[PDB]
């Protein structure tokens, strides 16, 4: 009772903002703290997550004008409970269809506890079940977040709606996310991609590390996917993925366009840099009307290989370009110490790729 | 005694993790706080270093799965005592030969107090006596660390062993460090190099500042040295 | 631990003199409080006995210049333990042969627990 009075005083001081523990969070790796998070987040104050493993029985929904900061990766840890069912990302903005604004997230771990579902499992449909999903949002800063044991993706930026839209080439989906910054984040043990963007624009991804997917499909470190545009990636690292940085679209979607890679290091990926537009590669297909403008510089590729068997034993590449118009590559170093890992083509420019330039290789 | 009870409550709240002051650290520029650091670090909790100058009579050894964060450069300051002898880096991973994993260090100053030895002095042998030495480690993040008055280097990433191996051209030394990130760090007043790498791979050095060595030999801001490979340096400054 | 700090302050106030509970007396009808009584009585302060049944395993010896006051009859109760043997009064002056002086005793029950025999 004395300690409770002391705690009350500390909490009133609001040295970090409001602590989730003020609203009843235990952070003991066992107790369901979801209500404390919801209460703290609805209070209007910046929210602080101190040391602990904070168990949650459902997704943490973020309204507009949210500040959520933790004590740091592997210090403040947020985690799905073993008993959580299917359908929700661990953390995502409240308004799934038309979005939210001004969300600032920093310094904690998101553990999606994919383990709880058994092994070999990925997202149940569309953009559902990432560790962090941002849909139709404006002005989002994501810093120093570690995303582990993820069902779908680690961090996904997408347009409004739970599903990904397939509106055809040369279209722009409604409700993009816009003005997004992802910095010093790590993604690992994901089912699809570590850090990925869809149908959204004005995004900087800086100094992040995406590595070691759980699964063996099109599992990429950084996937700049359907509908993306106006994105800069700089000084990130990918390791042990299929694609290091993939820039593309699926068929029936517009390819990512006007993308800048300002330095990247790809370690033991299959295709370190893989730019493509499915449905627009065949000689007898229509040229992509959207696959245009990639400027990529100071690219490092190390020991590309397919020891893990990604994508039905697709052959390794330092660089693979297809479909795209206007790809400018400057300063590329590919290095291996094992001649048997990559045996077909080190760098390919094929499959309707056009007006491409390679310098300083 | 009342204040002690209040402090006890605060400490149980663990707002940052565990404070070194909880384990008896004074941070008064005089008292030897090494035991508090060792106790905090062995507790299994993330460790926090608040405002103060925390004096240490021997090197701070880091085990695997360590989180050590301070209140910031020139706020949380860790410093060798005047009476410290020769042979140790100020901070380094526990297992010197085969290494450690998952070490996350942020937001403090390391003052190697090289001054205490007289002027003109550098490391006693091999990789000994840097402000921070990482040997044979995997997954190390070093952020917002200021390294000053350093005997050997400010920050050194190397393979296992206290000495640097000389195995000949075209070789790969055993026990590399691997997956290392050094960001927003500053190194100054060092005897050899500010930030340096040896026999290690997959390293990003970003936005750091290495300047003004004490000595006048092969004293480099950033030295990517013997056995290094697969390193990116970006947006750093040397002076 | 907080309550202990509060108690420490109260005890320093010495509103009655010194309480036997300050020296470790329980007054719970079970615990042997003889040492607390002896300590309090040797301290030189007037001694106060608050509410309780204070069990004693031997006679309470009174030196000269003693003030011993209780919360009242059937409130402060002093009692021999069941296991006490033979030979002692429950309360008596220390110097049995040539005596003591200035002893002021007020407001408590003495239960000699003769039943035990
Ligand atoms: Co993918
Ligand atoms: Co996608
Ligand atoms: Co040098
Ligand atoms: Co060197």
UniProtKB/Swiss-Prot annotation, chain A:
Binding positions (Mg(2+)): 198, 223, 225
Top-level taxon of origin: Viruses
Entry's localization field: Virion
PTM section of the record: Autocleaved to produce the 74 kDa gp12* assembly attached to the phage particles. Autocleavage of the C-terminus is a posttrimerization event that is followed by an ATP-dependent release.
Known function: Structural component of the 12 appendages that hang from the lower collar. Adhesion protein that binds to the host cell surface during virus attachment and mediates teichoic acids degradation.
UniProt remark on domains: The N-terminus has three domains that function to attach the appendages to the phage, digest the cell wall teichoic acids, and bind irreversibly to the host. The C-terminus is an autochaperone that aids trimerization.
Subunit field text: Homotrimer. Each appendage is a homotrimer of gp12*.
Descriptive protein name: Pre-neck appendage protein
Species name: Bacillus phage phi29
The organism's taxonomic lineage, starting at the top: Viruses, Duplodnaviria, Heunggongvirae, Uroviricota, Caudoviricetes
């Amino acid at each position: 009772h004395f300690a409770d009075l002391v705690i009350q005083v500390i909490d009133e001081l609001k040295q970090f903002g409001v602590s989730v523990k003020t609203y009843g969070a235990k952070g003991d790796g066992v107790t369901d703290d979801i209500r404390a998070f919801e209460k703290a987040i609805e209070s209007g104050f910046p929210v602080y997550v101190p040391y602990g493993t904070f168990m949650v029985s459902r997704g943490i929904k973020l309204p507009s004008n949210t500040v959520l900061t933790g004590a740091g990766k592997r210090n403040a840890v947020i985690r799905f409970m073993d008993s959580v069912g299917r359908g929700e990302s661990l953390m995502y903005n409240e308004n799934v269809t038309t979005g939210n604004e001004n969300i600032f997230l920093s310094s904690f771990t998101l553990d999606g506890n994919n383990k709880r579902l058994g092994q070999g499992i990925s997202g149940i449909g569309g953009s559902r079940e990432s560790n962090l999903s941002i849909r139709a949002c404006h002005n989002v800063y994501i810093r120093d977040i570690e995303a582990v044991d993820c069902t779908l993706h680690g961090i996904d930026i997408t347009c409004g709606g739970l599903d990904y839209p397939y509106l055809g080439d040369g279209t722009t989906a409604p409700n993009p996310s816009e003005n997004i910054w992802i910095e010093n984040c790590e993604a690992t043990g994901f089912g699809d991609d570590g850090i990925t963007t869809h149908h959204s624009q004005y995004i900087n991804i800086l100094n992040c590390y995406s590595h070691d997917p759980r699964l063996t499909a099109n599992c990429n470190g950084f996937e700049i996917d359907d509908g993306s545009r106006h994105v800069v990636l700089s000084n990130n690292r990918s390791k042990g993925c299929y694609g290091g940085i993939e820039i593309k679209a699926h068929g029936d979607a517009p390819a990512a366009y006007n993308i800048s890679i300002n330095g990247h290091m790809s370690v033991e990926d299959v295709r370190s840099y893989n730019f493509r537009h499915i449905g627009h590669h065949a000689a007898t297909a229509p040229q992509s009307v959207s696959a245009k403008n990639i400027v990529a510089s100071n690219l490092v590729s190390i020991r590309p290989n397919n020891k893990r068997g990604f994508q039905d034993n697709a052959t390794p590449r330092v660089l693979a370009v297809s479909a795209y118009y206007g790809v400018v590559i400057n300063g590329l170093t590919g290095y291996t110490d094992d001649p048997n890992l990559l045996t077909e083509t080190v760098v390919s420019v094929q499959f309707r790729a056009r007006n491409c330039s390679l310098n300083g290789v």
